[PDB]
Amino acid sequence: GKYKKGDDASYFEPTGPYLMVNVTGVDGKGNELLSPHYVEFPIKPGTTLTKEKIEYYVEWALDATAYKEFRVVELDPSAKIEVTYYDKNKKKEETKSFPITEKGFVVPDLSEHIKNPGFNLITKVVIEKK
Amino acid sequence: YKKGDDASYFEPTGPYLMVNVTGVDGKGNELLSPHYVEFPIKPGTTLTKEKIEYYVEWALDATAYKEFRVVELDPSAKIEVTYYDKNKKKEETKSFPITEKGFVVPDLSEHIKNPGFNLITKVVIEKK
């Protein structure tokens, strides 16, 4: 490609829990500047993900694009981290949502159901150049 | 490695600004009929009215009017980009007005590697 997202990034699917960032970067006046690029970051259950760590993960997800030099200004207040998996026991698909807060929430261990759950972050973020 | 020197004899492989300019004098007599030039651009750049003015002046340097300066730009000018949305399977077109504050060049990577940002305008030019 002309900008192949993935310097070295794993060629095969992740072997453990990961955070998937899919943000759309916008300016203040509501103009879309950057379309969502797929980016993965491994995470560990037991970790606490706060709003500040989320802000830094999205700034790092931009470094994978042409907007590598932008900083996060403001994260959509309604963003949440969602995870979807199939529960072995009940036999249904289930989805958990965690809100992005200052105190934060702890990464759950869903390994009993899936070894590599995908924690999804899909929002808009106002970004500005450094 | 950035975005290319003297520019390609083929189609660019990165975002680029296509400049289509008609140069007139202070009386609207036409001096230069539509003249086309390409400039590579980088997503994330803020394109202001003043920057556009400089780009059109540079566009004139490859013509009999290289010694002329841009005096006024048509106030109805706009930058438009047309691409094919890969999610919607349709043609999409975005317009950006030329203003003093300007606008930030979007990255349309998800849909097209080398989008062409079209600038069609008429400008008053006068010898320096």
Nearest alpha-carbon partner for A49 in A119, A127, A113, A125: A119
* Pair B62, B37: CB distance under 8 Å: yes
* Pair B31, B24: CB distance under 8 Å: yes
Q: What resolution in angstroms, rounded to 1 decimal?
A: 2.3
CA atoms of A119 and B48, how far apart (whole Å):
39
- The shortest CB-CB distance from B106 to any of A32, A70, A129 is to A32
Q: Which two tokens stand for residue B111?
A: 């849909």
Q: Checking DSSP bridges between strand B116-127 and strand B16-24, what pairing results, if any? A: parallel
- Experimental method, per PDB record: X-ray
Q: What is the CATH number of the domain that holds B37?
A: 3.10.20.130
Total residue count of chain B as it appears in this document: 128
DSSP B10-31: S--SS-EEEEEEEEE-TT--EE
Residue numbers of the domain that contains A122: 1-130
Which DSSP category does B122 fall into?
E
CA atoms of B100 and B103, how far apart (whole Å):
9
Does A33 contact B110 at a Cβ distance shorter than 8 Å? no
* Pair B83, B115: CB distance under 8 Å: yes
Beta strands in chain B (DSSP E): 16-24, 30-40, 46-47, 68-73, 78-85, 90-97, 103-104, 116-127
Is B39 buried (19+), middle (13-18) or exposed (0-12) by CB count in 10 A? Answer: middle
Q: Which two tokens stand for residue A128?
A: 């500005």
CA atoms of B71 and B125, how far apart (whole Å):
5
* Pair B95, B62: CB distance under 8 Å: no
Query: Which residues on B lie below 8 Å from A33 (Cβ)?
Result: 43-44, 104, 106-107
CA atoms of A121 and A81, how far apart (whole Å):
5
> What stretch of H or E contains A125?
strand A124-129
Distance from CA of B6 to the nearest CA of A (A): 19
Interface membership of A101 toward B (CB under 8 Å): no
Domains in chain B, number: 1
How many contacts, defined by CB atoms under 8 Å, are there between A and B? 44
CA atoms of A34 and A130, how far apart (whole Å):
16
Q: Checking DSSP bridges between strand B68-73 and strand B116-127, what pairing results, if any? A: antiparallel
